[PDB]
């Protein structure tokens, strides 16, 4: 009955198991017209050197990820599968080529250097992401924040405006509890996303509870 979801899949969030993959689909597919799956597949990179490795470490270390999530996500669809084509799976690399994207992105881009709220809301996000990255780094500097800002501006598109971006009339953004996005949801408030955006908060008890 909904119009249309987005699902954003990050390297680093662990609810995105198969199983949990696969719940979430199902449940998206029943209740919208159309469902976007992203995953982030962008500036992760950074973040590795910001740690402190080489180029080539990250750069091997990213590609690795990204394959362990692809096949996966293919798994995933799989196993709901007869029809798999009723969503659309892109990385965000991809999706930043568009237009659309690219339209809002502007827009974005520019709230964040113009709007007091939507800036500290973008930088706790930031910081969320960074205090809850992979692997063994501990300690944040100038270099983290750096990446993590990079990384999440080219999310910001997705945030603010999934209704420009992927051309429909509403969207709802589904979230789990603890991650990045909750920082940004939680900042202080007269600034509105988008018209037609939403975010709805999915707790695996409550799927598998309506499944």
Known sequence: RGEHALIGISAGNSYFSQKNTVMLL??????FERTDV???????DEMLIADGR??????????????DL??????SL???????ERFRVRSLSELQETPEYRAVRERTDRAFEED???ATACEDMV?????????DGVG???????????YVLAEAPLFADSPGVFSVPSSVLCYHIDTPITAFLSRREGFRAAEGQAYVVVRPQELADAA
């Open 78 to 84: 799989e196993s709901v599968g007869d029809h798999a």
């Open 140 to 150: 944040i500097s100038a270099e983290h924040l750096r990446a993590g800002l990079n």
């Open 38 to 44: 992203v995953y982030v597949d962008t500036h992760i």
């Open 116 to 118: 007091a709220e939507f």
């Open 26 to 31: 199902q449940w998206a597919g029943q209740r």
């Open 54 to 67: 080489s180029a080539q470490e990250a750069e091997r270390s990213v590609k690795r990820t990204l394959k």
């Open 127 to 135: 910081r969320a992401v960074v205090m809850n990255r992979p692997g």
């Open 70 to 75: 692809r096949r996966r996500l293919r798994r």
